[PDB]
Amino acid sequence: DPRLYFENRSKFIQDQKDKGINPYPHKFERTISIPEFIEKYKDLGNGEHLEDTILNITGRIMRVSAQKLRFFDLVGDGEKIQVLANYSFHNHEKGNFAECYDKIRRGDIVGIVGFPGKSKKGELSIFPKETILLSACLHMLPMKYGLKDTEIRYRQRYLDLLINESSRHTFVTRTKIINFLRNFLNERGFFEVETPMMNLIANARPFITHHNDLDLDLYLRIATELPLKMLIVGGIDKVYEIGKVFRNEGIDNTHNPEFTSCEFYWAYADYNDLIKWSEDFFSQLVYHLFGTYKISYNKDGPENQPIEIDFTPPYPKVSIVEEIEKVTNTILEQPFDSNETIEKMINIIKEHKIELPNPPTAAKLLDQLASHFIENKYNDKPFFIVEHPQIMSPLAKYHRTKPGLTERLEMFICGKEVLNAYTELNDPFKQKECFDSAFCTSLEYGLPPTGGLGLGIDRITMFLTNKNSIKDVILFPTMRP
């Protein structure tokens, strides 16, 4: 019984207390980490002991086996050495050999005083002259299988990190990705800021909460767009923010209501500048992690074959309106709001037995046509969908040569959006929504020509760590109790 094992250990904790031994001592003076231990002593010869060097080392006992030789696994920082407790090397003054090492269970945190060496079998080991209990583990830890089907991976992420080596590697990579992005932006002149997480006016339903001092209801931000643009007016010409945004909608495998975004604004940047930034960032980010531009991705899970994703630039550019016509052998033109055009779009959706969006707005229909007919055109390499109609992007600047369109771009990997960008509409007389109030007033003080860009960091982490669910890249995903 896990229940009964917990009570035995808890009684042991009192038992130790009433023998005068504190099972939770204050401080152990460590000399060296486990990863530093492995590097420093990996190339010794087999069976060799460095008996003069005395080290203080800590770690988590992860495996216990045995009659006067005791073997443990000691793990720290995702790496592992062996503990070889020899009765001959023990300091019999500190207590009975057997009594000390019989109390120890898998999962215990211990401090060890000892010397480094390799086994006769060549396993690099610490040879304890003394071993102190530093913090007991009171439950039975599980082994790997316990954490494959269940969702305690998500409710008890600390157990996952201890048991599954890959989980650590996933979450190191996530941190490496964000470091690379921050460094990539800082090296190019960009300036990182923080804008508010609550605002008075907030596409998506907001999180709402009551602010007790102002006696007002506030909204968690759904993006960082408006405050960053104001900083462009203010003269910070390259500005960005990495932080959480919130959309109070349904969960699925690539949608978490709270997620991590990077948005930047680049004054005097145009469409080519933005395309170039996107190809440089992804191609260099992949190479930095993997030493190659090609990665394998299990688009349909580990039970199915992976596809290969090639991040070698340049990436294809697919114009959305033109492409929908070609694959559908249709012609969609004029006001796309034209009921005529709408009907062509609506009849395409029913002929191919697709869901009709409610309401059947021209922007919603075009999006639906793109997810079915364009968004899975390539899967072997990322690509852009470009030049969306103005009705789908009311904040975007008009395309320079094609009427009705914008210079917008969207990057896709395996049919999922990861990057969104366009040049900004800066003539206040043509921004329809200026019939948020602060942004319109700021526009009248002069916004230079500007490009904005946003990245979805969780999804980017999913592809580069071969995950299909967003919960596998968020440390503590929010679940019902």
Ligand X SMILES: COc1ccc(OC)c(Nc2ncnc(Nc3ccccc3S(=O)(=O)CCCNC(=O)[C@@H](N)CCCCN)n2)c1
**How many CB atoms are closer than 10 A to CB 131?**
27
d(CA 196, CA 429): 28
Is position 200 an interface residue for a second copy (rule: CB under 8 A)? yes
228 versus 414: smaller Cβ distance to a second copy? 228
Hey, is 230 helix, strand or coil? helix
Q: Which does 418 bind (CB under 5 to 8 A by kind): a second copy, ligand X, none?
A: ligand X
User: Which among 110-118, 123-131, 302-310, 419-427 is the span making contact with ligand X, rule CB under 6 A?
Assistant: 419-427
List Cβ neighbours of 110 (8 Å cut-off, separation of 6 or more): 58, 59, 61, 74, 104, 131, 132, 133, 134
Q: Which does 428 bind (CB under 5 to 8 A by kind): a second copy, ligand X, none?
A: a second copy
Is position 175 an interface residue for a second copy (rule: CB under 8 A)? yes
Which two tokens mark 162? Answer: 């201890």
Is position 191 an interface residue for a second copy (rule: CB under 8 A)? yes
* Beta carbon of residue 278, minimum distance to a second copy (angstroms, whole number): 17
**How many CB atoms are closer than 10 A to CB 226?**
17
Alpha carbon of residue 137 to chain centroid: 29
Which two tokens mark 111? Answer: 């401090």
* Beta carbon of residue 424, minimum distance to a second copy (angstroms, whole number): 11
Is position 108 an interface residue for ligand X (rule: CB under 6 A)? no
* Beta carbon of residue 440, minimum distance to a second copy (angstroms, whole number): 11
d(CA 206, CA 479): 19
Alpha carbon of residue 479 to chain centroid: 17
Hey, is 402 helix, strand or coil? coil
Which two tokens mark 173? Answer: 């990579």
Is position 44 an interface residue for a second copy (rule: CB under 8 A)? no
* Beta carbon of residue 110, minimum distance to a second copy (angstroms, whole number): 10
Is position 458 an interface residue for ligand X (rule: CB under 6 A)? yes
Q: Which of residues 37, 60, 366, 375 is near a second copy by CB under 8 A?
A: 60
DSSP state of 187: H
* Beta carbon of residue 311, minimum distance to ligand X (angstroms, whole number): 16
- Per CB under 6 A, contacts with ligand X among 177-206 are 204
The strand ranges marked E within 52-120 are: 55-65, 69-76, 79-86, 109-118
333 versus 367: smaller Cβ distance to ligand X? 367
182 versus 377: smaller Cβ distance to a second copy? 182
DSSP state of 252: B
Q: Which of residues 82, 131, 341, 423 is near a second copy by CB under 8 A?
A: 423
User: Which among 119-127, 240-248, 275-283, 381-389 is the span making contact with a second copy, rule CB under 8 A?
Assistant: 240-248
* Beta carbon of residue 43, minimum distance to a second copy (angstroms, whole number): 23
Q: Please give the helix or strand (H or E) that residue 441 lies within, else none.
A: helix 437-443
Burial (CB < 10 A; 0-12, 13-18, 19+), residue 332, is buried
- Per CB under 6 A, contacts with ligand X among 159-178 are none
Q: Which of residues 173, 223, 257, 402 is near a second copy by CB under 8 A?
A: 257
Among 46, 112, 110, smallest CA distance to 85 is for 112
- Per CB under 8 A, contacts with a second copy among 391-410 are 397, 400, 407
| Footprint on this chain of ligand X (rule: CB under 6 A) | 204, 223, 225, 247, 249-251, 255-257, 259, 261, 263, 395, 417-422, 424, 452-454, 456, 458-459, 470
